[PDB]
Design a protein around this ligand. Sequence first.
Ligand code: HEM
Ligand SMILES: CC(C)Cc1ccc(C(=O)O)cc1
Ligand SMILES: [Cl-]
Length: 393
Amino acid sequence: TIPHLAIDPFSLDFFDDPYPDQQTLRDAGPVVYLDKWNVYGVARYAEVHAVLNDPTTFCSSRGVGLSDFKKEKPWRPPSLILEADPPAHTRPRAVLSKVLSPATMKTIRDGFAAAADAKVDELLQRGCIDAIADLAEAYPLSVFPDAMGLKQEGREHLLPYAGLVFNAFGPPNELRQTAIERSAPHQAYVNEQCQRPNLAPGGFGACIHAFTDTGEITPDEAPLLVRSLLSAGLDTTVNGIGAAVYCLARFPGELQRLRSDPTLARNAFEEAVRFESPVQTFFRTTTREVELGGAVIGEGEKVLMFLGSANRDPRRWSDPDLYDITRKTSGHVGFGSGVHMCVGQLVARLEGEVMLSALARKVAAIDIDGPVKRRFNNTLRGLESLPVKLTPA
Ligand code: HEM
Ligand SMILES: CC(C)Cc1ccc(C(=O)O)cc1
Ligand SMILES: [Cl-]
């Protein structure tokens, strides 16, 4: 009854242009079977949202990559938050929610905004810049490692480590195997920085360790929760900000609306997160036989959720393929949904808001002016190089 498709959603041809195949995945039915990898797939908004909000049946403790932790060894010790279900998930989640809380955002906002303003002014002096290396990477690198409290030495391992993490959620294709092979130096750097003596007092890392006093996490849990922030907290924002700039470059009408009201910066970033969905996919594992979209899925089955597809499903979104900075974005799944919804979303939105605010106030036009190159990753969608000319306001 369930349709079987040969589409490989982790193929370079799919990454190069995923939208026709995402429509095929939605329109084949509410649930598909992907013969290439022997997993179920759900690509429509309703089912993706339902699965995310059904954690007792669609669990995370057997891994949110293709690999099932009940069957294979995890490539690194499992995340205490991402790869945990309630109740084990609950207190580690509360610790990160407090470390990255509304109140915490007050302590970093002025510096994060100042760094964005200065970066945009610097790029305007250069005029022709690469919006990936010179902006989407440079700006988060200038704020987030410091906000973590990381030392200077070794920071060149952060983005390679994150590329590995996100590649490793994928199937054992060439991207994943090349990522994991000889990755020990990246792992050793990150694991060392998670130990309490290496984290500057006052930064996110030290604050995680300070929560061991409360009973919410033990001392031996704190390094793995620092590791969570060093895994998810940088490369995501690189692709989120990159997506926003690419959107503004492609939709000059929307850049002009943002210039006219820079208070749209935060929703312009949220719409970029829906529109591009920098985190494209991840998995759940069934804990029991379950009916979904009229299909009966057995226990212990991997289910691939297409977040980017759900964020463009015309069943849910009007003009889903348009970038609209005044869209009512609430309900998009680019940050997830339910108990695992991105605990770093206020940090992500802060960075995106203040960069888009700096662009809105300082830049009059953004023109692609060189070869654009895509960056391939089993989980992340974004660009390797985005040459643009920035004209000052
Ligand atoms: C635009 C930027 C970002 C995007 C699109 C994004 C996306 C996501 C998504 C889709 C999930 C859900 C995972 C699941 O349900 O299995 C998630 C969870 C998570 N994210 Fe974000 N993220 C971003 C930025 C960040 C940042 C800046 C941080 C930390 C400073 C962070 C830390 C985390 C953590 C620790 C989790 C696991 C939460 C849990 O399992 O309860 N992320 N993220
Ligand atoms: C979209 C998510 C898969 C991003 C992510 C990655 C890693 C972690 C961790 O806890 O290590 C948490 C969240
Ligand atoms: Cl590691």
